């Protein structure tokens, strides 16, 4: 290494986002092309590693920060996010993607709080009453707009409004039936509303866009565990654990406190199975 030495605590002094070891990607020649190409033709686990490798070189890579947060959301890892997206927002506050992708990360942890502020910042680029007011905005203007029309469901989900969120997704789903993300939302509202059987089929089809969306199959496991067949949940969470990480010599594990979430489900499953 000679001079490649540390740089880790050097970039960590301000960015608390851990970089972890076992990231050989970082020095082949320039990992950006393989990192970006891995999304289309492969999984989405080592892609985050490549994004981290290209990001650690300098903090001015806006693309690296805006993509690392999005990548560390699919592979169930919504604790390594938030801070990275905030740092990306610090670099540019007019950016559209960082604000849009920062709301999906503050609603999993049930933070509420800054999620409404991020939605307002995205749109411009009682707290709830004010946020919902400005949100209406293009109630009709730019109707064919996918992002604006889909944001209504995200607004409804943070107020336990799973009734109209699915309704606006249904129009948003058919507008651009290509990306899996919009389809996953379509599933979630249904699951989170005494309606499991009406979404699982989408969970299967969503997989044909990119077989790896850990979130869809995790929700599959949750829904079937809530829908009788108490086993099966195990025979999906076990492969969830495997595909989640660990294919590159446990990825240089380090802390992996967040991963606990997944592992937890296994228990609640086994137990209800008397095991």
């Amino acid at each position: 290494y000679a001079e490649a030495q540390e740089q880790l605590q050097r970039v960590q002094n301000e960015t608390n986002y851990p970089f972890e070891p076992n990231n050989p990607y970082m020095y082949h020649d320039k990992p950006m092309e393989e990192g970006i190409a891995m999304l289309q033709l492969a999984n989405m686990a080592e892609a985050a590693l490549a994004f981290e490798a290209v990001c650690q070189k300098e903090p001015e890579n806006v693309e690296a920060w805006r993509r690392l947060g999005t990548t560390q959301a699919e592979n169930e890892k919504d604790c390594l996010a938030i801070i990275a997206l905030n740092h990306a927002r610090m670099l540019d506050p007019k950016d559209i993607a960082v604000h849009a992708a920062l709301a999906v990360s503050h609603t999993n942890e049930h933070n509420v709080g800054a999620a409404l502020q991020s939605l307002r910042s995205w749109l411009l680029s009682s707290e709830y009453r004010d946020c919902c007011t400005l949100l209406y905005a293009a109630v009709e203007m730019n109707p064919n707009d996918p992002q604006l029309h889909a944001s209504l469901g995200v607004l409804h989900n943070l107020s336990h409004r799973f009734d109209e969120a699915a309704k606006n997704f249904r129009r948003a789903v058919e507008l651009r039936p290509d990306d899996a993300h919009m389809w996953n939302k379509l599933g979630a509202t249904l699951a989170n509303g005494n309606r499991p059987q009406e979404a699982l089929e989408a969970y299967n089809r969503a997989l044909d866009i990119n077989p790896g969306y850990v979130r869809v199959m995790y929700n599959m496991a949750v829904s079937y565990s809530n829908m009788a067949q108490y086993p099966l949940a195990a025979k999906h969470i076990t492969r969830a654990i495997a595909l989640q990480a660990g294919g590159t010599n446990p990825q240089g594990e380090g802390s992996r406190i967040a991963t606990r979430g997944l592992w937890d489900l296994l228990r609640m499953t086994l137990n209800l199975m008397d095991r």
């Binding site: 169930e76 979630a188 989170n192 809530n226």
Partner: protein
């Protein structure tokens, strides 16, 4: 000695229960209050009472809720008894499917925050879906790795209070203190036991009416209040009495017998039922059998068992879609 913390003492089942506990709590015992809004206004109100030997502590919180509020992590140090009373009211709203989810999203956090700093502490659930929300608390406790079946109770004394009020009016040459009640806390689940009380009983044509009125009780109160609230005054009285019973048992000045809603522990299947137990220094001590049952109550008991089985299953798996 003895620290009691009411969690959510800023509503109608809040401040009133706190006031009732203030004037009956034993000398030399503190009292803690927490709520996202209105807690300082109650602390500044309960500190102007001439009761001696009682000190009041209070904490507030940010109006936008945040998981693991720092104030609770500090106030929950040294607490001996927790009364989880917060949550949305029993407002009709929409069907039960959403209210249960809303309250599950609250109990999961308000148990996780409290149990981390003070593990050995009795818990009293006085929220909504008490057939669905107690297993949620049990699951939340099991996760962190600490769980004692002898220190988790569901306050279902309101049904007993209602039951020992209608038999004292129709049959009013006599007065009886209490009547056994089994089952759970729901509409078709509560089963009064009128065959275990002294004195002759009226004809069967009236006993069934009394049992039906005991089951369908809160709906008449809701109708009497149109839609602008529910019954809170008569529910804070039962919670205060149960908390006093638990405090006396913990101190060592009584070993009372209470019914509550506790774990069966492999005795009657359906492992969350309302059966009589005896308290003690270390929580539950002995779980007593139901006793002789009239042949007309067995059908009600089996229907209640089935309904509670379904409710237990539905509540012990409240998860989330993440998204």
């Amino acid at each position: 000695m003895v620290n009691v913390a009411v969690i959510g003492a800023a509503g109608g089942i809040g401040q009133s229960l706190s006031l009732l506990l203030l004037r009956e709590l034993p000398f030399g015992s503190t009292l803690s209050l927490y709520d996202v809004v209105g807690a300082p206004g109650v602390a500044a109100d309960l500190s102007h009472i001439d009761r001696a030997g009682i000190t009041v502590k209070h904490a507030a919180g940010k109006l936008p809720p945040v998981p693991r509020d720092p104030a609770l992590t500090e106030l929950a140090e040294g607490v001996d008894v927790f009364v989880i009373v917060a949550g949305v009211p029993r407002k009709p709203g929409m069907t039960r499917d959403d209210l249960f989810n809303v309250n599950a999203g609250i109990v999961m956090d308000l148990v996780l925050t409290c149990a981390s700093v003070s593990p050995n502490a009795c818990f009293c659930i006085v929220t909504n879906p008490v057939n669905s929300t107690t297993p949620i608390a049990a699951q939340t406790l099991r996760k962190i790795g600490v769980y004692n079946k002898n220190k988790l109770l569901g306050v279902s004394l309101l049904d007993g209070l209602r039951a020992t009020r209608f038999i004292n009016n129709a049959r009013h040459p006599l007065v009886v203190p209490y009547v056994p009640v089994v089952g759970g806390h729901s509409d078709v689940t509560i089963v009064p036991l009128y065959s275990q009380i002294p004195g002759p009983l009226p004809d069967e044509s009236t006993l069934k009416e009394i049992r039906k009125r005991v089951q369908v009780a809160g709906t008449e109160v809701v109708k009497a209040k149109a839609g602008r609230g529910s019954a809170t005054l008569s529910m804070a009285e039962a919670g205060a009495r149960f908390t006093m019973h638990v405090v006396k048992a913990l101190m060592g000045l009584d070993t009372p017998m209470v019914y509550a809603y506790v774990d069966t522990d492999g005795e009657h299947e359906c492992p969350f039922l309302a059966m009589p137990v005896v308290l003690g220094k270390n929580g539950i001590e002995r779980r007593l059998p139901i006793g002789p049952i009239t042949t007309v109550e067995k059908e009600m008991l089996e229907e209640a068992v089935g309904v509670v089985k379904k409710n237990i299953a539905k509540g012990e798996t409240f998860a989330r879609s993440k998204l």
